[PDB]
Amino acid sequence: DSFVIRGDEVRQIAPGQTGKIADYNYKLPDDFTGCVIAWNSNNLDS
Amino acid sequence: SALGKLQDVVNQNAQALNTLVKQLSSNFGAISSVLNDILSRLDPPEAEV
């Protein structure tokens, strides 16, 4: 699952989380998940 | 009190049942003894714990 997101909002990409993204943008099941990866994109996005 | 043998049996049965019922209010280290409230105010992770 590929997407771009705000830096500070990364903390919501987890099980057992609440917030704007968790409720309206991206929710995770309470289960095993392979791995969460992320990298900065200032050189290519902003 | 000429029938102590029967009265003891009745009393012990009643005592066992009463204690068993009373145990439902014990916390067992939980936040609260009532399932409905722990669930009603806690997120699924901790609520489940």
UniProtKB/Swiss-Prot annotation, chain B:
Subunit of the fusion protein that is processed upon entry into the host cell. Mediates fusion of the virion and cellular membranes by functioning as a class I viral fusion protein. Contains a viral fusion peptide that is unmasked after S2 cleavage. This cleavage can occur at the cell membrane by host TMPRSS2 or during endocytosis by host CSTL. In either case, this triggers an extensive and irreversible conformational change that leads to fusion of the viral envelope with the cellular cytoplasmic membrane, releasing viral genomic RNA into the host cell cytoplasm. Changing residue 27 to K: In strain: Omicron/BA.1, Omicron/BA.2, Omicron/BA.2.12.1, Omicron/BA.2.75, Omicron/BA.4, Omicron/BA.5, Omicron/BQ.1.1, Omicron/XBB.1.5, Omicron/EG.5.1. The chain holds residues 943 to 991 of 1273 of the full protein. It comes from Severe acute respiratory syndrome coronavirus 2 (2019-nCoV). Residues 7-49 form a coiled coil. This is Spike protein S2'. Changing residue 12 to H: In strain: Omicron/BA.1, Omicron/BA.2, Omicron/BA.2.12.1, Omicron/BA.2.75, Omicron/BA.4, Omicron/BA.5, Omicron/BQ.1.1, Omicron/XBB.1.5, Omicron/EG.5.1.
